Amino acid sequence: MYVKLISSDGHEFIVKREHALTSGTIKAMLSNEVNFREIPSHVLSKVCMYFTYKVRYTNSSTEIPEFPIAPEIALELLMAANFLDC
Amino acid sequence: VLRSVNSREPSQVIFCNRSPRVVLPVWLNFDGEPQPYPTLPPGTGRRIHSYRGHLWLFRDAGTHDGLLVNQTELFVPSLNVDGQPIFANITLPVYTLKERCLQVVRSLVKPENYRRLDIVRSLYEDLEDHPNVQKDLERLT
Amino acid sequence: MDVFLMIRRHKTTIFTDAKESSTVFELKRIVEGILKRPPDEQRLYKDDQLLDDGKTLGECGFTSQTARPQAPATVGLAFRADDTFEALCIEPFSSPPELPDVM
Ligand SMILES: CC(=O)N[C@@H](CC(C)C)C(=O)N[C@H](C(=O)N1C[C@H](O)C[C@H]1C(=O)NCc1ccc(-c2scnc2C)cc1)C(C)(C)C
Numbered sequence: 001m002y003v004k005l006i007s008s009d010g011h012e013f014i015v016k017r018e019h020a021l022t023s024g025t026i027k028a029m030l031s032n033e034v035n036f037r038e039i040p041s042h043v044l045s046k047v048c049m050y051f052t053y054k055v056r057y058t059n060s061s062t063e064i065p066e067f068p069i070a071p072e073i074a075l076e077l078l079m080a081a082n083f084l085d086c
Numbered sequence: 087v088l089r090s091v092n093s094r095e096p097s098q099v100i101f102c103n104r105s106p107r108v109v110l111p112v113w114l115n116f117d118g119e120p121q122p123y124p125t126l127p128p129g130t131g132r133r134i135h136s137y138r139g140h141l142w143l144f145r146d147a148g149t150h151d152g153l154l155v156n157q158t159e160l161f162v163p164s165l166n167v168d169g170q171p172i173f174a175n176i177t178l179p180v181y182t183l184k185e186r187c188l189q190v191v192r193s194l195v196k197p198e199n200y201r202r203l204d205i206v207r208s209l210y211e212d213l214e215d216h217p218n219v220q221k222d223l224e225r226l227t
Numbered sequence: 228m229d230v231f232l233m234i235r236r237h238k239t240t241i242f243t244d245a246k247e248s249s250t251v252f253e254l255k256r257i258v259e260g261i262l263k264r265p266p267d268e269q270r271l272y273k274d275d276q277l278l279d280d281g282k283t284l285g286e287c288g289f290t291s292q293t294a295r296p297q298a299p300a301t302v303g304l305a306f307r308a309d310d311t312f313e314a315l316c317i318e319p320f321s322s323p324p325e326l327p328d329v330m
Contacts, residue, residue, distance in 0.1 A: 002241075002261055009321050014241045014261060041320040045233075048242050050183045052231055052296040057180050061157075063104050064178045067297050069190045071330060072323040075203065078187035082209060086183045191330075199329040 004033040005048070011041035019051035023084040038083070043076045047084065054086075087227050088160075089118040091139035097163035098171040101144075102131045105178045110147035112219055113140060120219045126176075133171060136163045143219070144176045150217040151189060154179050159226060188212055228291035230284055234258060234271075235317045236304035245284060247291055252280035254302065264306060272303030272315050 003020050005013045020026050026034060036044060050067060057064050069077055090113065103109045103126040111123040113136075125147045126132060136142070142161040144153040154177050155161040161174050181189070192213060195203065200213045234241040234254070241261055245254055255266035271278045273287055284294075294300035305315045 007321070011238045011240060011318070011320065014239065016242070019242070042323055045240065045320055047183070048240075049297050049299065052242060052244075052299065054180055054183075056231075056296040064180060065295075065297065066106050066178060067181065067183075067186050069187065070323075071190070071194055072326060074187055074190040074194065075205070075327070075330075076323070078184065078191055078209065079205060081182070081184040081187050082206075082212075084183075194330045196329070202329050203327070 001032075003030065005044060006033065006035045007039055007041040007044040008037055009041050011044065013041075013044055013048050015048050015051060019048075019055050022051045022054055023086045025084045025086075039080050040076070043073060043080050046073060046077055047080055047086075050081075050086065087118070088114055088141060088223055089116055090114055090137070090141050092116055093137050093139040095138040095165075097136055097138050097140075097166055099134050099136050099163050100131055100171050100173050101126060101134060101176065102173060103128060103176045105153060105176055107146040107151070107153065107178070108148060109153060109176055110145045110150075112143050112145060114142070114223075118223070120223070138163055138165065142174070143222070144174075145217070145219065149189065149192065150219065151181075152179060152217060152222065153177065159222075184212075192216060230289045230291055230294035231296045231299040232289065232294055232302050233299045234302045234304050236306065237316055238318045239304075242299065244296075245289075247285040247289065248283050250280065251278040251282050251284070251287065254284065255280070258304065268307040270305040270307075270312055270315070272305070274303070275315065278302075 001017050002014050003017045005015065053067055101111055106128050109126040113121045113123060115121050140163055143159060144155050146153065155174050164172050200210050228247045229244045230247050231244050243257060251271055252266055254271060255269045258269060259265055278287055289300050303315045303317060305313050
């Protein structure tokens, strides 16, 4: 099953519920759509990619690549991760 | 507590850096002091002489970010079974998104400018509280 | 091998994975389960190229080493309203601000 995470600018990101539960903050907001008034789509898209990456590479032996973050999104992405606790 | 035991029983090891980071190997000596050893560029290996019961950990040489070795924090050379060296596979952990963001922000902002960033005081503190072996030795203890 | 995708239409983006050996039609069935629109009312695209139902994702250039979890490949999606297909439209994500001086 999937959940919808909606950015401040209206982008609707549909991701697997278990991936989204990577964030306890998101867990609280569900307990199946969540709006983020402070997280724009260029940040929330990256957050979703992080979920996929975390779930793919957690408990795996195959070599782990760097999670890439452009300098231009790092500050907002930092603020988002701190809010989402992930 | 966290110290190498003086076994005197040799153990040959391959430090194998399967990370994109320059790696600082750190040996915990008999008094528990971290002793740094020469670095390993990304994707390179070294054959080295250590001993059973000796304790090692591995860090990004530039930033001291935590690395894993055979999927754990610490590496202890074991008995060489039929002459073969023990492989110590050094890898990136799956960092939290927060910690990865802090890495990137640290790598772009001089520490004297952390305070100039528009963020909650707690994140300034998080940036300032950068990775450090001494803190990790306290946490593991 | 798994490929990791963003399937995108207007302001909708689905994050999902699929087998390199799976087909375009099969990806439409995945979209159908999520967005409740049958395969025949869907067009999938790679860039501006319409994808053929019978082709594997690998054949269309969605390979495990380029469609990665941390950087998924984009599949475009267009719906048929009644008689005719809408044109492919993907709303871009927002723009980051200018780097602060200190960065
Ligand atoms: C002195 C003592 O009470 N015991 C000895 C063994 C005893 C049989 C004399 C002993 O443990 N010696 C240490 C020792 O030889 N060590 C400590 C670690 O187990 C590894 C080993 C060592 O230093 N080997 C040489 C070495 C040189 C370079 C490297 C590295 S790491 C990355 N690149 C290189 C080239 C790795 C190992 C020291 C550093 C005290 C001399």
